[PDB]
Each structure stands twice: as C-alpha cells, then as structure tokens.
Design a protein around this ligand. Sequence first.
Ligand SMILES: [Ba+2]
Ligand SMILES: [Ba+2]
Ligand SMILES: [Ba+2]
Ligand SMILES: [Ba+2]
Lengths: 153, 153
Amino acid sequence: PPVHPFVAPLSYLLGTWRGQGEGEYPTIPSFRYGEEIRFSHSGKPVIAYTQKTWKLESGAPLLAESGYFRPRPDGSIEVVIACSTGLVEVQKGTYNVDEQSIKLKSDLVGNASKVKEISREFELVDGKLSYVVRLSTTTNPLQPLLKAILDKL
Amino acid sequence: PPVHPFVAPLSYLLGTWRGQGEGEYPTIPSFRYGEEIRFSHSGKPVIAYTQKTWKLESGAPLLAESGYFRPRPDGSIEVVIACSTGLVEVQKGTYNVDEQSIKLKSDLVGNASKVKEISREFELVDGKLSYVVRLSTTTNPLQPLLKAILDKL
Ligand SMILES: [Ba+2]
Ligand SMILES: [Ba+2]
Ligand SMILES: [Ba+2]
Ligand SMILES: [Ba+2]
C-alpha cells in the first residue's frame, strides 16, 4: 500500500524510534526510562501510534500508549491517545513542516484522577524525535514532566 | 513475563483472532468487512488490544481501534479505546469467567458528533470470539450495529 495526501507531509515521523527518557516533577525525582514509539498508516488520513516504556537494566515493561494521528492541510491536527494506565485523551493542536514538529494540548482528558491538562510535543531535532509531555495536576500548573529522545529504526 | 493474578481469569482471550463482521443500522443496510482482534500483555494488570477491519476482496483498510482493558478481581472491568475515526471511549462493565463474557458500556464517548452511547460485548460463543457492538445516536435508541464471530488463530 501507498501514502495518502494528508499523511504525506508528516511522512518523516514514519517508522520505529527508540531511545530513553527522563521524567521529573516537583512531586517526584529524576527517573529514567527506555522508549519505543512507532509511527504508521494504511494510507488513510491517519497515523497510528504505539509507544512503550521499560525499566533500563531489567528493563521490564512500564507503560504503553496506542492512538491515531489525523492531520489536516491547514496544518491542524487531532490526536487520540489511549493509556494503559487507563487514560484517553483527545489532543487538538498543529504541525509545522519546516521545523518538523507536532504540538498538542489536551482538549478532553478522560478517567483523570487529578490530571487537568497534558500537552505533548514531537519535533524532529537534529534527526531524532524529541518527545516531551508537559502536565498539570489539581495542584500544579502545566509544566515539563517527561522528555525523551530517540533514533530511527 | 507472567499473566497477573488480576488478568489471568481472562487468559482465554490472549492472542490474535481473525474472522468477519457485518454492519447494519436503520440508516445503512447490511455490510461486511474482514476483521482481526488481538489481545496481548506484558506481565502487568492489563490486556492490550488492537483491532482492524478491511474490505473482503480488496482487502483494503476500513478502520483500526486499540485500547487497554482493566480487569479487577471483583468482576468489574474498565476499558480504554482510541479509535481510527479519531474517537475515544471509556468503557465500563463486568466480566464473567464461566459465561466467558465481557459486557461493557460507555461512561465517556469523547470526540463524537452524533454518537451517544456505545456498548461492547466480547463473549466466547462455541469456541470463537463473538464481538457484538450496539450504538445509540442523537436519533436512535441503543440498538446493534456491528456483529463479528472470530476464530482463535
Ligand atoms: Ba499549506
Ligand atoms: Ba526542528
Ligand atoms: Ba472473585
Ligand atoms: Ba459463553
């Protein structure tokens, strides 16, 4: 199968990325994980997304996301991500093709304990995905929580 | 990595299951698609899910949907999903080891125009996974929509 036009200006994300992150909030201290994200399509105006963390040495699986990227020509995008931890999110946002990013903020966060708003940001810096999630809780304003780098499989 | 005491009651679902579905609602007549389900795990208290439909001779992509199930020992189970159309469900219900059934219903259907309720149902009928879906819109009662019969692969 071949690419559809909506998905072709984000065709660079396509494929398997692998690296490590460092999470860290005011409420918790520096912690580090490995990461694997996959980007794909069956040529609809949608990019499938699967992510997964694991503990570095062990590394027994931690967490896992799957979700779908639906981009539009106006540079608009909407992203729906499920959580193993039991979230769903409906992230609205945009993507710019010069810089090669995506940039979202949650619109609906569901089955959210104390989670107010999450804003994810996948930009290709220097050839590698640079995947940030910022977060707000019922007690802290939005700020950088995770941050992970990765390399093309 | 081991099937967690919480999950192992459901272990009869683990794996990849292929078959075909059939749609029909009062506004669309009967249809037919190929369909795969796969439940996996990673030794945590969650079964992962991923599903996809094609066109029977094409077999060209229709949709995908993927989430996470959260079984609890009590009986209660909460499901998560992000769907290809670009729609999230918080699924909520109750499984049943000996009837082999998982009856769920939506406590949050996010990013939906005209969709009001959804219920899923996975059961083992005589050897194979039946997958019955039922929907209600702005204009329709909760009536069935999709029905699939899959074969453990
Ligand atoms: Ba343009
Ligand atoms: Ba850049
Ligand atoms: Ba019991
Ligand atoms: Ba039965």
